Amino acid sequence: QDFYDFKAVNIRGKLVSLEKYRGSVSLVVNVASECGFTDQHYRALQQLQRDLGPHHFNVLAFPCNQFGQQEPDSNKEIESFARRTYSVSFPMFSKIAVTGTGAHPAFKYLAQTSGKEPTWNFWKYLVAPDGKVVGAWDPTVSVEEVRPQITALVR
């Protein structure tokens, strides 16, 4: 088992296999819309996608309402917000839990194998081409500090 064995409903309601990302590097991020981190993070994540997307990399953004309830809106609203405000071009998924008993199994996998579970919005896991977690950061770590770790993995 690895991260790319899991399935998730995308933000438009279409079920997808994360197998479609195998061979690629992924930055798996739990997102929120009303957070203090929201604007800086969405801007940095989109720039990350712009710069490293062409090197077989994606941000995989999963909305989550668990942390301060800063993602209360519908999947439709969240997508509209991300696309119109930040010109987001990375994959976005339907709102999920990332922690607790009801967490998405893919997020159970990332927490169990990394030893860290998300404790706020905008936690970030780096997944290697083979679907294994090689890094995890909390939202206070800048995308300037995360990015070089991603470029190390891409070709």
Residues with catalytic annotation?
A: 35
User: Cα separation of 57 and 71, whole Å?
Assistant: 25
Contact call for residue 115 and Cl ion (CB under 5 A)? no
Instruction: Please classify residue 15 by burial: count the beta carbons closer than 10 Å to its beta carbon, then call 0-12 exposed, 13-18 middle and 19+ buried.
Output: exposed
Is the Cβ of residue 54 or residue 148 nearer to Cl ion in the bound state? 148
Count CA atoms within 13 Å of residue 15 on its CB side. 2
Q: Which helix (H) or strand (E) holds 151?
A: helix 143-151
Binding span for Cl ion by CB under 5 A among 17-25, 37-45, 119-127, 143-151: 143-151
Number of residues that bind Cl ion (CB under 5 A): 2
Among 13, 54, 115, 148, binds Cl ion (CB under 5 A): 148
Among 7, 112, 151, 152, binds Cl ion (CB under 5 A): 151
Is the Cβ of residue 110 or residue 143 nearer to Cl ion in the bound state? 143
- Closest approach, Cβ 63 to Cl ion, in A, equals 27
Q: Quote the distance between the C-alpha of residue 145 and its chain's center.
A: 16
Is the Cβ of residue 20 or residue 55 nearer to Cl ion in the bound state? 55
Q: Quote the distance between the C-alpha of residue 56 and its chain's center.
A: 15
Binding span for Cl ion by CB under 5 A among 25-33, 39-47, 136-144, 146-154: 146-154
- Closest approach, Cβ 140 to Cl ion, in A, equals 20
Whether the CB-CB separation of 87 and 46 falls below 8 Å is answered with yes
Binding span for Cl ion by CB under 5 A among 72-80, 90-98, 115-123, 147-155: 147-155
Q: Is 109 helix (H, G, I), strand (E, B) or coil?
A: helix
Phi, psi angles (nearest 5°) of residue 147:
-50, -50
Binding residues for Cl ion, per CB under 5 A? 148, 151
